[PDB]
Structure 1
Amino acid sequence: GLISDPVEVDPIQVGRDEAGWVQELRDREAWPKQEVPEQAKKPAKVGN
């Protein structure tokens, strides 16, 4: 593209989201307390 073009999607960010190890948390200011997100309770991987 061009230098003046808007910033494109980083492949590192795509892979980071694919791995799914970015911490998601319950909304602190929500009432009643939210249920735990899916990633917050995903098991540890059997290998790597």
Structure 2
Amino acid sequence: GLISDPVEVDPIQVGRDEAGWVQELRDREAWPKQEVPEQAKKPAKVGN
């Protein structure tokens, strides 16, 4: 739109989030230890 306008969401970022391979981890300073996020234990894709 305009140069001064706020930055639009990146389509690359949207696609990367959709693929769901960004790494999320348990918090270091949470007691008791947090559960494993559902992303960290997903299985490998069946097709290369």
Alignment TM class, shorter chain as reference: over 0.9
How far apart are residue 7 of structure 1 and its match?
0.5
Q: Structure 2: where are the runs of 5+ without partners?
A: none
Report the number of matched residues: 48
Which structure dedicates a bigger proportion of its chain to helix?
A: 1
The percentage of aligned residue pairs carrying the same residue is: 100
In the aligned structure 2, how far is the partner of 1:27 from the partner of 1:35? Answer: 10
Extract structure 1 runs of 4+ deviating beyond 6 A: none
The CA RMSD over aligned residues, in Å, is: 0.6
In the aligned structure 2, how far is the partner of 1:4 from the partner of 1:44? Answer: 42
Q: Structure 1: where are the runs of 5+ without partners?
A: none
In the aligned structure 1, how far is the partner of 2:6 from the partner of 2:14? Answer: 17
In the aligned structure 2, how far is the partner of 1:44 from the partner of 1:11? Answer: 24
